[PDB]
Symmetry: D2
Subunit: 283 residues, 4 copies
């Protein structure tokens, strides 16, 4: 998996038939190599229709998700293995090449206490079996580290690496998010250096979830480190600029993040492509 990507939420929150087409056509109009397709309601996604659309527009894809609370692997690992295996099935039917995201828990998961060894044991056994199922399907399996307000289990790149190393599956990769690294990494580039050869997917996201290039992420440090470790994964723009006010509660966003999704695709995709070139990413 290598090239530039855009998250489908730049257009669509749902994945009905038309939403799928509008997002896929848009990502192709912006010359992306990948679209990242969110899986929120597994019954509702038509895998054959999505595969046809991708073929029409010469686009590749990865899927992402967040485990629903009944499937949180830290307490209910068997429900997680079922839900992730189900997700991997529809990913592989779609033509996607990986499932990534918060594949290990929730984005409002707290126990109130530091993460325990019994929790990390459930995670290890849950992710071990599903990545296995991913391997039988030829898919890769990602783990996105997120900030301490969303999850208590995987916050820093170091914790994601330690999880991957314990499972021992060569088809699991570490997935980092510049919005979350901005809070969690002691110097954002240190997240990328810790991940090193496990790092195969990035969410390139401004510090306010707006337009990359216009916030607090130290993009030179980020691209310095991706270049120095020889990064050859996917760089996917993640922004909240097209989120309606209804989505507020699910994403903890209470006021507009940018002027509009048009501005974010125009300027944010070109910024990521021009920084990639300055630092000879994929060179």
């Amino acid at each position: 998996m290598q090239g530039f990507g855009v998250h489908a939420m730049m257009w669509s929150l749902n994945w009905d038939h038309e939403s799928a087409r509008r997002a896929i056509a848009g990502a192709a109009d912006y010359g992306q190599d990948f679209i990242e397709i969110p899986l929120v309601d597994l019954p509702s996604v038509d895998t054959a229709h999505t595969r046809a659309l991708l073929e029409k527009y010469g686009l590749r894809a990865a899927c992402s998700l967040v485990l629903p609370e009944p499937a949180w692997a830290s307490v209910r690992p068997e429900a997680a293995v079922a839900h992730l295996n189900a997700a991997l099935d529809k990913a592989a039917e779609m033509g996607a090449e990986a499932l990534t995201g918060v594949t290990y828990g929730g984005t409002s998961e707290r126990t109130g206490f530091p993460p325990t060894q019994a929790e990390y044991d459930n995670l290890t056994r849950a992710l071990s079996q599903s990545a296995g199922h991913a391997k039988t399907l030829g898919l890769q399996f990602g783990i996105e580290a997120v900030n301490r307000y969303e999850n208590h289990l995987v916050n820093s790149a170091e914790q994601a690496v330690a999880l991957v190393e314990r499972i021992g599956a060569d088809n699991i990769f570490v997935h980092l998010d510049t919005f979350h690294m901005n809070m969690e990494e002691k110097g954002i580039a240190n997240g990328i250096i810790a991940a090193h050869d496990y790092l195969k997917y990035m969410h390139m996201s401004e510090s306010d979830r707006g337009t990359p290039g216009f916030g607090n992420v130290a993009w030179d440090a980020v691209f310095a480190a991706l270049a120095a470790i020889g990064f050859k994964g996917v760089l996917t723009l993640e922004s909240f600029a097209a989120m309606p006010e209804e989505m507020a509660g699910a994403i903890s966003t209470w006021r507009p993040v940018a002027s509009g999704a048009d501005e974010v695709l125009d300027k944010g995709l070109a910024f990521l492509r021009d920084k990639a070139s300055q630092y000879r990413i994929f060179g």
Copy 2:
């Protein structure tokens, strides 16, 4: 109020006789002008004792708090005023010069929706009552903007500024926190510039609540902005280095933030002092 401050959390977050002695003498060993005292249990504070220790060490003080849920001003403004007024009576007894912090709601407050006009009506009237009560005691009243995960009402400097102008008191100041601006401000210095008329207090906190100078906050942009608007207030360090594991739920940190408090105090107060000199912060 002008000068350098350190939050008492660097030595404890209880405020019994012993914790007060340890924190106040600690802040004096480090040549601070101010200590920031958190008011967590109003019936338990020995205000007279604190006052005598402050005079003994020649230390000045600000008080800060977070409103408990029964008193969140957005939904229960009468309860907010009764609590804020009692906290102000304690601050004045100790000899503090201001009450600041999350004085309008909680740090775990959500409605699931963006802030509505009736919630701001409630905030405006509750803070205008209590700012008046603070005025009768000779104290100033502060509003600290925090990030979207802790609160949905006052996130950006502009919001804080617009709320001050609505209340129309002359003893209310805006209070910014670089850890929170690192998420909420579209370029951190834009927060300081927006508040140029009302900014009188800063929390100088690193992007991970660790040691200032060793994270992702753009300190040169922060200090340039403080210098250019002619900042005339307090620069208080805030870090979670002294926080034991048992506090993890109340602060949502599940990983140590630094080596030890002694290191944060040593390295962080020196960094802030050196950046202050470089940018001529107090003349």
Copy 3:
């Protein structure tokens, strides 16, 4: 004198009838407010022609120069005055509103020693009289600080400020250059802050003379300081991407600075615009 500007060197430094139209038409095409016209060989300037082009394309102009060695003001102030007064004449005929740049010495000036009392007295007397000649014409007069390898007299913003105060003329402004500031200012924002009373003109130039936004200049600090001091003048793009190799010696530049002037124009101009909008530079 307010808005965005591009230096004519983006097209060519020659200013015959062909070069002026191309440069002025090019500057209009990119929506600029000002073009900076270099005055090099004075007798080859048709100024009525240039004034016609300007008012046809709706463009304003400032003129810039460097003193040639026999007119260096530190040692030959009378020759400085006559040369400056002659540049001011043709600048006025063109309808430019200001003459700026290294109006006080050379870009290869060096005595081997720190600048002396007597050298500054020569500068003062020379610029004092030429600034008065500019006043009768309606022109403003600028002093551009440059780095220690090009000049030994005006390197820092505070030097420029002290010189302007010394001269006592109300029509001289400080001109600063982000490329030179990157070497001379102890934290680039401190030059902008120090000049805050007299700063009316900027050279927005990347650290390698390439494309602004793709080097080592800390643009968030630059723009934060501009906004916070309430900057009102012109922001002019300076870059060497159009210079042929025969210019190498004249600009101490031994390798290409970028991959073409069209790229620097398209990407660099839009970067200065988006940054200005982010920090709300012009309201």
Copy 4:
């Protein structure tokens, strides 16, 4: 060679008996692994005295120089070889482990033209010769890139690496300077990344030659790239704070650079120590 170093110029540029003592005791007092010994006037450097001091204080050493004009290698390669070999003889006698710096030319060298093939031909043969002499003495040989105003031949790390690869000698390393990279590298970390195969020595110097951490150098990007390429080498502090006013012409510095070598050693070495530990520079 591996560890932290400091330039003897922080104490003196003369290397007589008491300056050698002053500087070596001084470096040892700040816990340095290395001291960099300038070689300027060869017949006055006592080698037995210097070697004895180094072993008493547990200090290792590198020597450095600039070629005097009669021996610039680009135009007089036989003369360069003589001067380099004699300097190498002194360095070996002192106990030093390498000769580095501007070993291919001068710091006010310029033809007025971009560098030519024939010039690089002379460098290649002269450096080939003397690096083989250095090999006979058990020394490595360094080449330091400097900025376009000091030298027209070796400005970017890329040029350094190409030269090193042409000569083909297993004891030549690349040596970079953050002060010079801040001008020459399009994004400062790109130079470190370009040299990843041959980078074994850094001058850690602020953008104004003052105190590292209080200027314009992007230290997070610098230390990140160093970490990510797995740097094993020397991080040597370089600053002009201790240099008398009579030395202005040699270093093109016309005004004070910081506030004294004392503050520069104290705060700068502290800043490099803390940055080095943040990014885990040596494991």
